[PDB]
Design a protein around this nucleic acid. Structure first.
Ligand SMILES: [Mg+2]
Ligand SMILES: [Mg+2]
Length: 430
DNA sequence: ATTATGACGCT
DNA sequence: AGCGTCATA
């Protein structure tokens, strides 16, 4: 009763830029705005691979991972923007720099954890306390929440989308004002006010739109974010969790979209997150291990404690290129040349990093894949990284991998290499 | 022949 | 340390 913790101590948001690489290209090229548009890398093989898709194009069935030639079959008028190529490979610098624009704006409001190139968790707990003070018990007006959905409302005893949104928001705010909700619900609401402000500042100062989730932890905030896209934000309250989870496929929850989630479904014979509540913590630990079991037991109740880490910068800076099909690297100098290409981009990004962020990478990570091997990495070896010099890094990389070559002939490379990867890690303050 | 990333867990 | 998992544009 009085001692059951409810995972309602924090306010956490997850902000995710809508179709981010597409918005970066649309800001640069006004001709692409408000059109079915996608971003593609390379062009020769089947028109290139799509890596981002505008919501106008999604309506035609265009998706990420699709070949541009195939996307054009679904959407003949699809417009395309190409990822820059430098030194023979895709170069994502424009999007990394746009990401920094957005992350720096978010950081004015609160501590953020960079979760990917286009999304960040926000810990709003302190900001909410301060805003609550500034307020002096004044009601929160719907006008402060013009793009917010309250998940699960309206309910109980209009056929337009925006009308539905406001109906639910009014029920929520009516109940908050009447004192029929909880202090955590008030805290979430103020959290949502702050995220409207954050999202307005991002759009004003960059041109970019985003969606966001506001809840009591990272997992719920991420889930919330996806419920109403694009350009909207969603509040998932603790109380909304039983109904939300009762029909929520397990694979939709962050970290359960893969093999673990599949085993939860198979071993337990269930489909929805809410069905997990019927098992004891020990039962879940017996199937999924101590850590995952405890996590599952709390998560299916809407409770999770993973903190928003104070980390706005990436921990690693990496450079990779696949060499698929017949392009697999088969000669020694081929391997050396591409190692150099990679090492040159890496040096460029590392020198920029050292200047911007007052740190130095100390470990060089070399990874390769060989043909018809594994998936992903076949092999991964570390060596020291003492100097930001591309020729040295490339020579060093060759050294740690050169004995992978099973060839008799040292000029030839067998089995052919289908992937090269250089990654700088173990940063120290400098 | 999605590609190019990036974080974290296991042993 | 090296490998595997899960995720994002
Ligand atoms: Mg996303
Ligand atoms: Mg994202």
């Amino acid at each position: 009763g009085p001692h059951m913790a409810t995972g309602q101590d924090r306010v956490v948001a997850l902000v995710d830029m809508d179709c981010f690489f597409v918005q970066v290209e649309q800001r640069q090229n006004p001709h692409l705005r408000n059109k079915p548009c996608a971003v593609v890398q390379y062009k020769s093989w089947k028109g290139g691979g799509i890596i981002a898709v505008s919501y106008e194009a999604r309506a035609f069935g265009v998706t990420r991972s699709m070949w541009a030639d195939d996307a054009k079959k679904l959407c003949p008028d699809l417009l395309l923007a190409q990822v820059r190529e430098s030194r023979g490979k895709a170069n994502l610098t424009k999007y990394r720099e746009a990401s920094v624009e957005v992350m720096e704006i978010m950081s004015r409001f609160a501590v953020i954890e960079r979760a990917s190139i286009d999304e960040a968790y926000v810990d709003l707990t302190s900001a909410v306390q301060e805003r609550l003070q500034k307020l002096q018990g004044q009601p929160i007006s719907a006008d402060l929440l013009p793009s917010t959905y309250i998940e699960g409302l309206p309910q109980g005893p209009t056929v337009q989308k925006e009308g539905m949104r406001k109906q639910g928001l009014f029920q929520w705010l009516d109940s908050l004002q009447i004192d029929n909700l909880t202090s955590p619900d008030l805290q979430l609401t103020v959290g949502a006010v702050i995220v409207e402000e954050m999202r307005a500042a991002i759009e004003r100062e960059t041109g970019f739109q985003c969606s966001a989730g506001i809840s009591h932890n990272k997992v719920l905030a991420k889930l919330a974010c996806g419920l109403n896209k694009p350009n909207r934000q969603t509040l998932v309250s603790h109380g909304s969790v039983p109904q939300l989870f009762s029909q929520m496929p397990i694979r939709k929850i962050r970290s359960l979209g893969g093999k673990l989630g599949a085993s939860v479904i198979e071993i337990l014979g269930i489909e929805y997150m809410g069905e997990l509540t019927q098992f004891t913590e020990s039962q879940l630990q017996s199937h999924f291990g101590e850590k995952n079991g405890s996590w599952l037991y709390a998560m299916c109740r809407g409770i999770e404690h993973d903190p928003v880490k104070p980390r706005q910068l990436p921990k690693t800076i990496g450079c990779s290129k696949n060499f698929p099909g017949k392009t697999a690297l088969a000669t020694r100098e081929q391997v050396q040349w591409w190692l150099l290409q990679l090492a040159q981009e890496l040096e460029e990004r590392l020198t920029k990093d050292r200047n911007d962020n007052d740190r130095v990478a100390t470990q060089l990570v070399v990874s390769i894949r060989v043909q018809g091997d594994k998936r992903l990495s076949s092999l991964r070896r570390c060596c020291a990284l003492t100097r930001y010099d591309a020729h040295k890094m490339s020579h060093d990389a060759f050294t740690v991998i050169k004995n992978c070559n099973t060839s008799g002939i040292q000029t030839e490379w067998s089995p052919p290499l289908t992937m090269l990867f250089l990654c700088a890690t173990k940063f120290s303050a400098s």
